[PDB]
Amino acid sequence: KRFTRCGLVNELRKQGFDENLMRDWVCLVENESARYTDKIANVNKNGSRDYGLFQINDKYWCSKGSTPGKDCNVTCSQLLTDDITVASTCAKKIYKRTKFDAWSGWDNHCNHSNPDISSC
């Protein structure tokens, strides 16, 4: 599925994402997945891939093989669903550790002001 700018802000708030990080989250998502929940990045230098809305790397976060992953305790295929509850708790887990430094999309397209979320 693909959210609109406001459909996404609505979801993130419902999902409990921290309000003052909101514009950063919106920016990140739009530059990592263009708001698609089922997007799957092309292989990086290291055979790793990025999954779903948050483009979460399969190197340390999700399992490629049927049984619940690594640090996020989930399968990467679970981060491609229309319901993003699982991907969210994981995305939060990642932020708690490496902030947004994990996402190159954020480091590149989110360092000079984000979109304004009120209107949503």
Curated annotation (Swiss-Prot):
What's its EC? Answer: 3.2.1.17
Using the record's annotation, list all stretches that form the C-type lysozyme domain.
Answer: 1-120
Query: What CDD domains would the database entry show?
Result: LYZ_C_invert
Q: SUPFAM superfamilies per the record?
A: Lysozyme-like (SSF53955)
Instruction: Quote the InterPro entries the UniProt record gives.
Output: Glyco_hydro_22, Glyco_hydro_22_CS, Glyco_hydro_22_lys, Lysozyme-like_dom_sf
Q: Which GO BP annotation is one of this protein's?
A: killing of cells of another organism
Q: Does the keyword Disulfide bond apply?
A: yes
List the active-site residues. 32, 50
Alphabetically sorted, this entry's keywords are: Antimicrobial, Bacteriolytic enzyme, Disulfide bond, Glycosidase, Hydrolase
Pfam families in the cross-refs = Lys (PF00062)
Q: Which SMART domains match?
A: LYZ1
Instruction: Give the molecular function GO annotations.
Output: lysozyme activity
EC class, as a word, reads hydrolase
Q: Kindly state which reaction or reactions the protein catalyses.
A: Hydrolysis of (1->4)-beta-linkages between N-acetylmuramic acid and N-acetyl-D-glucosamine residues in a peptidoglycan and between N-acetyl-D-glucosamine residues in chitodextrins
**Cystine bridges: which residues?**
6-120, 27-110, 62-76, 72-90
The family database entries (PANTHER family) matched by this protein are listed as: LYSOZYME C
Q: What does this protein do?
A: Lysozymes have primarily a bacteriolytic function; those in tissues and body fluids are associated with the monocyte-macrophage system and enhance the activity of immunoagents.
Q: How does it assemble?
A: Monomer.
Family the entry assigns: Belongs to the glycosyl hydrolase 22 family.
Q: What is this protein called?
A: Lysozyme
Give the source species. Antheraea mylitta
